[PDB]
Design a protein around this ligand. Structure first.
Ligand SMILES: NC(=O)C1=CN([C@@H]2O[C@H](COP(=O)(O)OP(=O)(O)OC[C@H]3O[C@@H](n4cnc5c(N)ncnc54)[C@H](OP(=O)(O)O)[C@@H]3O)[C@@H](O)[C@H]2O)C=CC1
Ligand SMILES: O=C(O)COc1cc(F)ccc1C(=S)NCc1ccc(Br)cc1F
Length: 312
């Protein structure tokens, strides 16, 4: 299969990237180095993950080694919720740029639609545990994102964890200058996202699937359904002489999605890339879709009263 998808900014995005949430800072530099050595050309990052400096060390070393050229990499990061303010967006982007050792990002996303009170804490709470909102809306945040394109800091802008109506808000914005290129959302066989994917794809927005393996290392995991251990998915994998993870990665690829599995295990980083030499049948695809149960890795009770919390 073709390795890149065309975005509505005219640039091409690798359909397979390396996730970095939870990648320990003492492991992620090697993980990214290995990933680039074995063919990855897309890294998914975020300031809130607290490891962009270490990701950046890897990127810079591989550029300095001339393993890759900068134009061949597709580096994605995300604006955290406490920086939804006109006067904070540029500096947030620039901190990410400085940490990643870059002069531009290929794609910069609004990480979640909700703005929170600015400050040192990533999740400012009231004394009863509710997140403290910002009054700044997704449209004003979007205008700030558009400025980053116009200043050369980012080549593309997009959104993440935006629901149907929030995507529509963005598309209907008065004076919209740049459409979102991407909506990055959770997507896997237990949360197949057909409705949101069809909406987004119908509008030309590319969808990136996060937590494609069901985020087994998520910190709130309970001893919960498990994609990697689902014998029905294992059976499809066995039939194709592939791993369950490889099936779980190939699945979104054949839906015209980008997918960003995370690993810090070198052998798995390599395994996860070996997904361009086999095809799931239409019956396999429909069978995997049939496993939907509307199960989310990423949700957060403290944020559920925010006006713009995306999920119900
Ligand atoms: N925009 C957003 O709000 C969000 C974005 N994301 C992005 O998506 C990425 C991927 O999602 P994430 O939630 O991390 O979870 P994933 O679904 O990618 O699962 C990661 C887990 O799977 C394990 N694993 C990886 N490959 C294999 C394999 N071949 N066999 C068995 N186990 C394997 C990893 O172990 P190990 O590392 O030990 O090898 C790790 O424990 C994130 O890292 C982040 O970049 C995720 C959530 C939210
Ligand atoms: O968010 C990620 O990329 C991965 O997850 C995280 C990554 C971090 F570095 C810190 C917190 C999270 C959490 S708890 N994320 C879920 C979450 C956050 C905010 C809102 Br609005 C809703 C929600 F569901």
């Amino acid at each position: 299969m073709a390795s890149r998808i065309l975005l509505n900014n005219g640039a091409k995005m690798p359909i397979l990237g390396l996730g970095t949430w939870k990648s320990p800072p003492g492991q992620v530099t090697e993980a990214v180095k290995v990933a680039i050595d074995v063919g990855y050309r897309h890294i998914d990052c975020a300031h809130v993950y607290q490891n962009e400096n270490e990701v950046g060390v890897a990127i810079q070393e591989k550029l300095r080694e001339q393993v890759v050229k900068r134009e061949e990499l597709f580096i994605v990061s995300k604006l955290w919720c406490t920086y939804h303010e006109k006067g904070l967006v540029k500096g947030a982007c620039q901190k990410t740029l400085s940490d990643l050792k870059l002069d531009y990002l290929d794609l910069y996303l609004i990480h979640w639609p909700t703005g929170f009170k600015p400050g040192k804490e990533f999740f400012p709470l009231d004394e009863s545990g509710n997140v403290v909102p910002s009054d700044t809306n997704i449209l004003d945040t979007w205008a700030a994102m558009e400025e980053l394109v116009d200043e050369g800091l980012v080549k593309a802008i997009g959104i993440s964890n935006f629901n149907h109506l929030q995507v529509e808000m963005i598309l209907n914005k008065p004076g919209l200058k740049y459409k979102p290129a991407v909506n990055q959302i959770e997507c896997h066989p237990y949360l197949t996202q057909e409705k949101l994917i069809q909406y987004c794809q119908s509008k030309g927005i590319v969808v990136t699937a996060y937590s494609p393996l069901g985020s087994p290392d998520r910190p709130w995991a309970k001893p919960d359904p498990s994609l990697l251990e689902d014998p029905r998915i294992k059976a499809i994998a066995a039939k194709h002489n592939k791993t369950t993870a490889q099936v779980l990665i190939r699945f979104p690829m054949q839906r015209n999605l980008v997918v960003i599995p995370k690993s810090v295990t070198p052998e798995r980083i390599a395994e996860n890339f070996k997904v361009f030499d086999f095809e799931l049948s239409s019956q396999d695809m429909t069978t995997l879709l049939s496993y939907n149960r509307n199960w989310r890795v990423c949700a957060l009770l403290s944020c559920t009263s925010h006006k713009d919390y995306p999920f119900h």
